[PDB]
Amino acid sequence: IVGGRRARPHAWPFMVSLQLRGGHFCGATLIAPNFVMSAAHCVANVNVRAVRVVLGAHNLSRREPTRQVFAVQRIFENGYDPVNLLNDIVILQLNGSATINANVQVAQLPAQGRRLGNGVQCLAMGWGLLGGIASVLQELNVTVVTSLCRRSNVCTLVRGRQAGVCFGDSGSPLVCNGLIHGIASFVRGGCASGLYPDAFAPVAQFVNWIDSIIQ
Numbered sequence: 001i002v003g004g005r006r007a008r009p010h011a012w013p014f015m016v017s018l019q020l021r022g023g024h025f026c027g028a029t030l031i032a033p034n035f036v037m038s039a040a041h042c043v044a045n046v047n048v049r050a051v052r053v054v055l056g057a058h059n060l061s062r063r064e065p066t067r068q069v070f071a072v073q074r075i076f077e078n079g080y081d082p083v084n085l086l087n088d089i090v091i092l093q094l095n096g097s098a099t100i101n102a103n104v105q106v107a108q109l110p111a112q113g114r115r116l117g118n119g120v121q122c123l124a125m126g127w128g129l130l131g132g133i134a135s136v137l138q139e140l141n142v143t144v145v146t147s148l149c150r151r152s153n154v155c156t157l158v159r160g161r162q163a164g165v166c167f168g169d170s171g172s173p174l175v176c177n178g179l180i181h182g183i184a185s186f187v188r189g190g191c192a193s194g195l196y197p198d199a200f201a202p203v204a205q206f207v208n209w210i211d212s213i214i215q
């Protein structure tokens with residue numbers, strides 16, 4: 001996240017770090033005790049057997065006993081298209097089930113088909129590049145825009161300065177009005193261009209599918 005701020009510790013208890021031999025590579029969102037959702041591009045070409053799913057994290061540089069760590073048992077796909085960067089969503093089934101507590105909570109999702117208007121105020125977040133990789137979870141106020149955005153995405157733009165998501169924020173939730181409406185998918189013009197909005201997989205278009213998998 002470029003131009004954001006440190007989150008209060010454990011402010012976003014559904015926020016997940018996907019890791020490979022102890023190194024963050026993507027965000028995800030806890031959507032049931034034994035499932036997270038992230039971007040399909042996050043696990044393209046990746047050794048899924050090596051992926052660790054880290055719940056209840058705040059500062060990745062620290063040892064944090066609040067953390068719970070799982071392996072990925074299975075992935076569920078929904079028509080990811082890497083050429084057009086469409087349907088950029090995956091569900092990762094965990095090899096066990098999270099202990100749900102203050103620091104580890106399931107996210108709330110929108111209704112299937114909900115579409116955000118121009119002007120909706122959201123929070124983006126993640127441990128991605130700060131302009132290297134963040135140690136402390138970052139959050140950022142953004143505004144939904146339809147200009148320079150396809151109908152098949154939800155896009156956001158920070159007004160009046162250069163700020164936005166960046167590499168390693170891939171897969172992270174966009175929270176609007178308390179609900180997870182986006183999964184960070186792609187940037188154009190480099191991170192924080194101030195020109196192209198950031199694009200997210202539109203979670204509300206995939207809710208019936210998510211529901212069918214997670215119960």
Ligand SMILES: *[C@@H]1O[C@H](CO[C@@H]2O[C@@H](C)[C@@H](O)[C@@H](O)[C@@H]2O)[C@@H](O[C@@H]2O[C@H](CO)[C@@H](O)[C@H](O)[C@H]2NC(C)=O)[C@H](O)[C@H]1NC(C)=O
Nearest residue numbers: 012120121122123124140141142143174175176177178179
């Ligand atoms: C910057 O964003 C914060 C947080 O955004 C809200 O909460 C997110 C989780 C998500 O649901 C967003 O869509 C929400 O807009 C805003 O914080 C709110 O601030 C008001 C006072 O302005 C306060 O009444 C609320 O309690 C705050 N909500 C939370 C959860 O902290 C803030 O207003 C945004 N600022 C701007 C200028 O956009």
Ligand SMILES: Cc1noc(C)c1-c1cc(C(=O)NCc2ccc(S(C)(=O)=O)cc2)c(=O)n(-c2cccc(Cl)c2)c1C
Nearest residue numbers: 041084085165166167168169170171184185186187188191
């Ligand atoms: C690296 C990498 N490896 O696989 C992919 C996909 C990427 C990739 C490609 C891209 C990418 O290709 N971006 C350029 C781009 C140009 C044009 C269009 S389009 C379909 O609107 O004409 C989409 C994306 C990308 O943005 N990102 C990205 C970077 C920062 C944050 C986030 Cl959430 C994503 C990533 C990670």
Ligand SMILES: [Cl-]
Nearest residue numbers: 020045046047
């Ligand atoms: Cl790998």
Ligand SMILES: [Cl-]
Nearest residue numbers: 113114115116
């Ligand atoms: Cl709607």
Ligand SMILES: [Cl-]
Nearest residue numbers: 187188189190
């Ligand atoms: Cl580009």
